[PDB]
Amino acid sequence: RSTLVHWFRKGLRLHDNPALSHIFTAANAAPGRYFVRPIFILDPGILDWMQVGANRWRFLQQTLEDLDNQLRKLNSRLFVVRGKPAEVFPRIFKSWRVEMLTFETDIEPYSVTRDAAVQKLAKAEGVRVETHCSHTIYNPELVIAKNLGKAPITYQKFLGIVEQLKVPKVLGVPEKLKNMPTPPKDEVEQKDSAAYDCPTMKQLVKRPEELGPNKFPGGETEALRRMEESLKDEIWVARFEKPNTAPNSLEPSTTVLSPYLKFGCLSARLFNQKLKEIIKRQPKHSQPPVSLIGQLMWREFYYTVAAAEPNFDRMLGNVYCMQIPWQEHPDHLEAWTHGRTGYPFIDAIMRQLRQEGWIHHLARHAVACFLTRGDLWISWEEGQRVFEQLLLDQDWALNAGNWMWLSASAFFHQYFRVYSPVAFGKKTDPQGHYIRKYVPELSKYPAGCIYEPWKASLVDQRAYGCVLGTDYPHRIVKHEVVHKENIKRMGAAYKVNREV
Numbered sequence: 001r002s003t004l005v006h007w008f009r010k011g012l013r014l015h016d017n018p019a020l021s022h023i024f025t026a027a028n029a030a031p032g033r034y035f036v037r038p039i040f041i042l043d044p045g046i047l048d049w050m051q052v053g054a055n056r057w058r059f060l061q062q063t064l065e066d067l068d069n070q071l072r073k074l075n076s077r078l079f080v081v082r083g084k085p086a087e088v089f090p091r092i093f094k095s096w097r098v099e100m101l102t103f104e105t106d107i108e109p110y111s112v113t114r115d116a117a118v119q120k121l122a123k124a125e126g127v128r129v130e131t132h133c134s135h136t137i138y139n140p141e142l143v144i145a146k147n148l149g150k151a152p153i154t155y156q157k158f159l160g161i162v163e164q165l166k167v168p169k170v171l172g173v174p175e176k177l178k179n180m181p182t183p184p185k186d187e188v189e190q191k192d193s194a195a196y197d198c199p200t201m202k203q204l205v206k207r208p209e210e211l212g213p214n215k216f217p218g219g220e221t222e223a224l225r226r227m228e229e230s231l232k233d234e235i236w237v238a239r240f241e242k243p244n245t246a247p248n249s250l251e252p253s254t255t256v257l258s259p260y261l262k263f264g265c266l267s268a269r270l271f272n273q274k275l276k277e278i279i280k281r282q283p284k285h286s287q288p289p290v291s292l293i294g295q296l297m298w299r300e301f302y303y304t305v306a307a308a309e310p311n312f313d314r315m316l317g318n319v320y321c322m323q324i325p326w327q328e329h330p331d332h333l334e335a336w337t338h339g340r341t342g343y344p345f346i347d348a349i350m351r352q353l354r355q356e357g358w359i360h361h362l363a364r365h366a367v368a369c370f371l372t373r374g375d376l377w378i379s380w381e382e383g384q385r386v387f388e389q390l391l392l393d394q395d396w397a398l399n400a401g402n403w404m405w406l407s408a409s410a411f412f413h414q415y416f417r418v419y420s421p422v423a424f425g426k427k428t429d430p431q432g433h434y435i436r437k438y439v440p441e442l443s444k445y446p447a448g449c450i451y452e453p454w455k456a457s458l459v460d461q462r463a464y465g466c467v468l469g470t471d472y473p474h475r476i477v478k479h480e481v482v483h484k485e486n487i488k489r490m491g492a493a494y495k496v497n498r499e500v
C-alpha cells in the first residue's frame with residue numbers, strides 16, 4: 001500500500017483546492033490501495049529568510065488547528081512534520097512509499113528554489129508530482145506570456161491582459177474519505193505518538209508577551225465566516241471604493257480578509273466569484289481599481305510583477321526599482337518602528353500594527369510615506385522588514401510592491417504629493433478617536449491639538465497629564481522642513497536614474 005501526499009504550505013484550506021481535491025478523489029476511486037497524508041512542514045529554514053512576529057505565529061497556530069479539524073471531518077487529519085524539506089522528503093518518500101505528491105504553486109524565490117529541489121528528489125524516487133496554481137486567480141506565467149514575456153507594469157495594462165484569460169473553475173470541498181484506515185506509524189511516530197500533531201501555542205509562540213488582542217482568528221472556518229459577513233451588505237460591496245474608506249476608523253473600514261488570503265485560508269478565486277455574483281445583482285457598482293474586485297486585482301498585479309523579479313524585495317538588482325540613496329538613521333528607525341516619532345497619527349498607526357497585526361491600507365500609506373520619501377529618508381526595505389514582522393497578512397509580493405509604490409521607487413512616480421502626518425488623519429477622524437485609543441497618554445488633549453500636541457502650551461500639557469519629552473516624545477523631525485528637502489533629494493535621484 002502506497003501513500004498519496006498533499007503538501008500544505010500556503011493554500012491552508014479544504015475549499016477550492018485542486019491539488020488537495022485530486023489526492024482525495026484518487027484515494028476514493030481506488031479504495032484499499034492508498035494511504036493519504038496531508039502534511040504541513042514546520043521548516044526551520046524559512047526563519048533565516050523572513051521574520052515572524054508573535055501575532056502572526058498565533059494566526060498560523062490557529063490556522064493549522066482549524067485545518068486539522070476540517071480534515072478530521074473527512075476521515076483524515078493534518079500531519080505536521082518538523083524539519084527541513086530537503087531532509088524530510090527523502091525520508092517520508094521511503095518510509096511512506098509515496099506514489100503522488102501534490103501542492104499549490106508559489107512564486108516566492110524561497111518557494112521556487114525549495115520546490116525545484118523537491119521536484120528533483122521526487123523525480124529520482126519515481127514519485128509523481130502534480131502542482132496547481134490556485135493561490136492567485138490568474139497564473140503569473142500566463143499573464144507574462146500573453147504580454148510577450150514582460151509583466152505589465154501598469155494596473156490598466158494588467159487588467160486588459162487578464163480580461164482575455166479564462167477564469168478558473170472554483171472547486172468545492174473534497175468528498176470524505178471512503179473506508180480509509182489510519183496510516184501505520186512510521187519511524188518517528190512510533191517513538192512519539194504526537195510527533196506529527198498540530199503545534200500548541202506554547203510551541204510556536206516563544207514571545208507570548210508580544211501577543212496583542214485576538215481579533216482575527218486564523219483558519220479557513222473563520223475566513224469563510226468573515227467573507228460571508230462582509231458580503232452581507234451587498235450595497236456596501238457593490239459600491240465599495242477603496243480610496244473612500246477610512247484609515248483611522250475604530251472598526252476596520254475594509255474586509256480584513258488579507259490574512260486569510262495571504263495564507264490561503266480563503267481562496268481568492270472563490271472570493272472573486274462571490275464578488276462577481278453581487279455585481280451582477282447590483283447594477284450600480286464601482287469598477288477597478290477602486291472596487292473590491294479591483295482590490296483583488298491589485299493582489300494579482302503585484303504577484304505578476306513579483307513573479308518576474310527574484311530581487312523584488314530589495315532595491316539592488318531589482319529591474320523595477322529606482323536606485324535611491326536612502327540614508328542610515330538607526331535612532332529614527334527605532335522611533336518609527338516603535339511608534340515614538342512624536343507625530344501622534346503616525347505613532348497611533350504603528351502601535352495598532354504592533355498590537356493587532358493589521359492596519360488599514362491608507363494607514364500603511366501614511367507610515368510608509370513618513371519612513372521613506374516623506375520624512376525620514378530611510379529605505380523602504382527597512383519598512384518592509386518591520387511590516388514583515390508585525391503583519392498578519394505579511395505577503396512577500398504585496399509588502400514589497402506596495403513599499404516600492406509608497407516610496408516612489410516603482411509604479412508610482414508623483415513624489416511631489418506628500419502625506420502630512422498632521423493633516424491626513426483629520427479628514428476622517430477630526431476628533432482623534434483613533435489617536436486616543438492607540439496613544440492614550442494624549443487622551444485628554446482636545447481635538448484642536450491632539451494631532452499636534454506641541455501646539456499646546458506647557459501649562460496645558462501639564463493639565464492634560466502628558467508633557468512632551470517626558471510622557472510623549474518630541475517630534476523626531478519637523479515635517480515642514482524635511483519633506484521639502486526630501487522632494488529635492490527625490491528629484492536628484494530621478495535625474496541620476498534617468499541618465500543611466
Ligand SMILES: Cc1cc2nc3c(=O)[nH]c(=O)nc-3n(C[C@H](O)[C@H](O)[C@H](O)COP(=O)(O)OP(=O)(O)OC[C@H]3O[C@@H](n4cnc5c(N)ncnc54)[C@H](O)[C@@H]3O)c2cc1C
Pocket residue numbers: 242252253254255256257258259261262292295296297298299300302359360361362364365368387391393394395396398399400402403406
Ligand atoms: C506599505 C504597504 C505594505 C503592504 N503590505 C501588504 C502585505 O504584506 N500583505 C497584504 O496582503 N497587503 C499589503 N498591502 C496592501 C493593502 O494595504 C492590504 O492588502 C490591505 O490593507 C488589506 O486590508 P483589507 O483586507 O481590508 O483589504 P480590502 O480593501 O478589503 O481588499 C481585499 C483584498 O484585496 C487585496 N488588496 C487590497 N488592497 C491591495 C493592495 N493595495 N495591493 C495588493 N493587494 C491588495 C488583499 O488581498 C485584500 O485582502 C500593503 C500596502 C502598503 C501601502
